[PDB]
C-alpha cells in the first residue's frame, strides 16, 4: 500500500494517540456483536451472549491487543505487508478457515472505533487514509 | 430483523442526531466520495469538494429518507419502493455501494455521538442500515 | 422482485431439473466444498469425499428446501422462517457463504440444463436465489 | 496463483476446447444481463434492452473476446499475474473506477458459460481449479 505524505501524517498522528491496551478489544468486541457469525471462531472465549458479556470479556480485549499489534505492525512496513502478514495469513487462511470478508469488516469496525474516540478529529479525509490502510492489510492477510 | 430492541435503539441515536440529521448526511456522502473514488462517478455533475452546497442540500435528501424509514420501519419497503425503483433501474447503483455509504453514515454518528454510539447501538443501526440497503436494492431481485 | 417473468422462468428449469433435484443438491454442495474450502468448517462431522452418503442426504434436503420456496415464493420469508433461525441464530452461518453455494446450485443447473439455461433464465434463477439467500440472513437484520 | 498440477490440467485441457470466438461475449452479455448495474460502463455499446439485444450485440461480442484474450494471457502468466494486468488495472481501477467486486461476478459467469458449454465434463474439480483462476485473476486486475 502507498499512501502519499498526508494520508501518512493523518495515520501517524492520529495512531500516536491510540489506547493501544483498550481499542484493540473494542474493535474484535464490536465484530463479535456486530456480525455475531464471527463468534463461530471463539468458542473457547466464554460467555459471549451479550454486548455487555463480550464487551467486558477477559479473552476478548486480551485478544483484542494482539489484533492491534498486527495492524501497527502493518503500518511500519506498508511497503511489505505481504511479507509481514506471511504467518498471519497461513494461520487464518490455512488453518482457521475464515473467510477473507471479514478481515475487511474488522478493518472497517475498526474504523468505527477510531471514530468513535477521535471525533471530530477522524475527519473525512482521515478516515480515507485509514480505508487505504486497513484494506492493504486486509489485502494481505488474504493472500494464502 | 428489526427487533423492537434495535427500534429502542434507532429511535435513540435519531433523537441524539435531531435537528444535525441533514449535515451529518452531508458528512457521510463526503467520507464515501474521499474513502471510496468509486462512488464519485455516481455524481459527474455534482462538485464534490468540501463547502458543496450540491453535497449538502443531497445529504439533508439523504436524511430525509432514512428518516421517512425510521418512521415507518414496519413498512420500508412500501415507504421506499420510489427510491429503490430509481436507484437500481435509473442510477443502476451496484449493491456493494450501498454498503460503504451505510459504512460512512455509522462512522459519522460515531464521530458525533459519544455516548449514543454503544456496542448495541451501533448492532442496531448497521441492521437498520443494511435493511434500508436490502429494500434500495430489492429492485434487482 | 420476482416479478411473473422471473416465476415462469423458475418453474421451467424447476421442471426440466424434475427427480433429479435432489442428486444436483448434493453436486451443488460437493462443488462448493471443492470450489471453496472454508465452507466445508460448517460440516465437520460429515464425510465430504464423493459418493458420500451424508452430502447425498443433504443435498435432497437443500433441494427440498428450495423447491417449498419456489412453492411459495409469494411469500418465502414465511416458509424459510424456520430455516433462518437455523441458518444465522444456530449455525452462524457467514452471509458470504450463500453467494457461494447460490453460484455453485446455478453452476450445477448450467451443467445440466443446455436448454434451460438461457441468459434470461440465469438472470430470474440468480435473482431467486439471492431472494432465498436474503431470507435466510434476515434473522442478522 | 499456484496451481497443483491436476488443477493445471483441469483448466489447460478445457481450454483448448474453448471456442474463443463465442464464450467471452456469452459471459460478458451474461454479465450485463444478470447484474444490469454493469450495463452503466457500456453507454457506448448501444441497444442492452432486453436478454437478445445484449446477447446479439456486436459490440457486446466484439469486446468479450478481448476480455476473454485477457483470461488466456493470464492462464499463461499465472505466477505473474500482477504484472500481467499491470495495464488493465490501471484501465479499470483509475480511468473507469469499476468495483473490484465486478471483476469477481465476471469471473464467476465465466465459470457458469464453461458449466454451460461443457456439461459433465466441467466435474466439481475442474470448477474448483477455474475458481482458483478466476479469483487470482480478480485479485490481479484489483491491485491498483
Ligand atoms: C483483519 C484483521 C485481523 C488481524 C490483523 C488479526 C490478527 C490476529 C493475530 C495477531 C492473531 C494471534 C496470532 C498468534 O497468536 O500467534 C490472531 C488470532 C486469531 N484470529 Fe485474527 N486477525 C484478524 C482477523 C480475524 C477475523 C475476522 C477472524 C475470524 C472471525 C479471526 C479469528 C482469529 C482466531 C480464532 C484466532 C486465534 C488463533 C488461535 O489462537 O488458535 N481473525 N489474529
Ligand atoms: C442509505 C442508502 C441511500 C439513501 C437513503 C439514498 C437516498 C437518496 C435520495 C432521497 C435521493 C434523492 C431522490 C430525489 O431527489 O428524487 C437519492 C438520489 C441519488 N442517489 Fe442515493 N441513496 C442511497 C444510496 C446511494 C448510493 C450508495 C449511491 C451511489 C454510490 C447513490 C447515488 C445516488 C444518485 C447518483 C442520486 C441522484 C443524484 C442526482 O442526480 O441528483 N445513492 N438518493
Ligand atoms: C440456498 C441456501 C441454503 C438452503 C436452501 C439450505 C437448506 C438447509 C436445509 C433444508 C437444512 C436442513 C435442516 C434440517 O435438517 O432441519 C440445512 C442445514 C445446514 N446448512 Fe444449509 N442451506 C442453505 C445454505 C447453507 C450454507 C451457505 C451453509 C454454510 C456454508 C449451510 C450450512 C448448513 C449446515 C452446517 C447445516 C446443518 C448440517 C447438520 O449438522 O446436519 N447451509 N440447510
Ligand atoms: C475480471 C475480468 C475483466 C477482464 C479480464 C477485463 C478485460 C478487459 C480488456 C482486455 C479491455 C480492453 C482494453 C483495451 O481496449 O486496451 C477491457 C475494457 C473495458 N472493460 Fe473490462 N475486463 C474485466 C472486467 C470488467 C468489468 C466487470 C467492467 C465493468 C462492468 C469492465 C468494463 C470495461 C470497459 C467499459 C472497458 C472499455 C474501455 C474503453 O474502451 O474505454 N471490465 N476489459
Ligand atoms: S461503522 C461499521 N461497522 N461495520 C462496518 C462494515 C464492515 O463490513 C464492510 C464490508 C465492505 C465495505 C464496508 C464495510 O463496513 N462499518
Ligand atoms: S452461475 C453465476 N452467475 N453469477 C454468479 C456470481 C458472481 O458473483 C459472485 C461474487 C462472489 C461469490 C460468488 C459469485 O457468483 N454465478
Ligand atoms: S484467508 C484467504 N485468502 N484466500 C482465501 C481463499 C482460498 O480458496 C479460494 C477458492 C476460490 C475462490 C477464492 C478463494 O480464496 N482464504
Ligand atoms: S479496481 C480497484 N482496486 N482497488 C480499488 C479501490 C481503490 O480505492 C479504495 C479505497 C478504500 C478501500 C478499497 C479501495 O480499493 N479499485
Ligand atoms: S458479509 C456481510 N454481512 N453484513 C454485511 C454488510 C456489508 O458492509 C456493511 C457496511 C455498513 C454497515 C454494515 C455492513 O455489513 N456484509
Ligand atoms: S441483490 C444484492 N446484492 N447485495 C445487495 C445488498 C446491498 O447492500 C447491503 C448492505 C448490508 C447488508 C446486505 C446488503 O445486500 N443486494
Ligand atoms: S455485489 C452483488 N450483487 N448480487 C450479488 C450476488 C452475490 O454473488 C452471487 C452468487 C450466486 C448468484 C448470484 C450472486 O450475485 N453480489
Ligand atoms: S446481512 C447480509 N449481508 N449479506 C447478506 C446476504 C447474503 O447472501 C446474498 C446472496 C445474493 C444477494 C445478496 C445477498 O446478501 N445478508
Chains 1, 4 share one sequence.
Do not use: I
Request: aromatic share 8%; proline share 5%.
Amino acid at each position: 500500500v502507498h499512501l502519499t505524505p498526508e494520508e501518512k501524517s493523518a495515520v501517524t498522528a492520529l495512531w500516536g494517540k491510540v489506547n493501544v491496551d483498550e481499542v484493540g478489544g473494542e474493535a474484535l468486541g464490536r465484530l463479535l456483536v456486530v456480525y455475531p457469525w464471527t463468534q463461530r471462531f471463539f468458542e473457547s472465549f466464554g460467555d459471549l451472549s451479550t454486548p455487555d458479556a463480550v464487551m467486558g470479556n477477559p479473552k476478548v480485549k486480551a485478544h483484542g491487543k494482539k489484533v492491534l499489534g498486527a495492524f501497527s505492525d502493518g503500518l511500519a512496513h506498508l511497503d511489505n505487508l505481504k511479507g509481514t502478514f506471511a504467518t498471519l495469513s497461513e494461520l487464518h487462511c490455512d488453518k482457521l478457515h475464515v473467510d477473507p470478508e471479514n478481515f475487511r469488516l474488522l478493518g472497517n469496525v475498526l474504523v468505527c472505533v477510531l471514530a468513535h474516540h477521535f471525533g471530530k478529529e477522524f475527519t473525512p479525509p482521515v478516515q480515507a487514509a485509514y480505508q487505504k490502510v486497513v484494506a492493504g492489510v486486509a489485502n494481505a492477510l488474504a493472500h494464502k | 430483523v428489526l427487533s423492537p430492541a434495535d427500534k429502542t435503539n434507532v429511535k435513540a441515536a435519531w433523537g441524539k442526531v435531531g435537528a444535525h440529521a441533514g449535515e451529518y448526511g452531508a458528512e457521510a456522502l463526503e467520507r464515501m466520495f474521499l474513502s471510496f473514488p468509486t462512488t464519485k462517478t455516481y455524481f459527474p455533475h455534482f462538485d464534490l469538494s468540501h463547502g458543496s452546497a450540491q453535497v449538502k442540500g443531497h445529504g439533508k435528501k439523504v436524511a430525509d429518507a432514512l428518516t421517512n424509514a425510521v418512521a415507518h420501519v414496519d413498512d420500508m419497503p412500501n415507504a421506499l419502493s420510489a427510491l429503490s425503483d430509481l436507484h437500481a433501474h435509473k442510477l443502476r447503483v451496484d449493491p456493494v455501494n450501498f454498503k460503504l455509504l451505510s459504512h460512512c453514515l455509522l462512522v459519522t454518528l460515531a464521530a458525533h455521538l459519544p455516548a449514543e454510539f454503544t456496542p448495541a447501538v451501533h448492532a442496531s443501526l448497521d441492521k437498520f442500515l443494511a435493511s434500508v440497503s436490502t429494500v434500495l436494492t430489492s429492485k434487482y431481485r
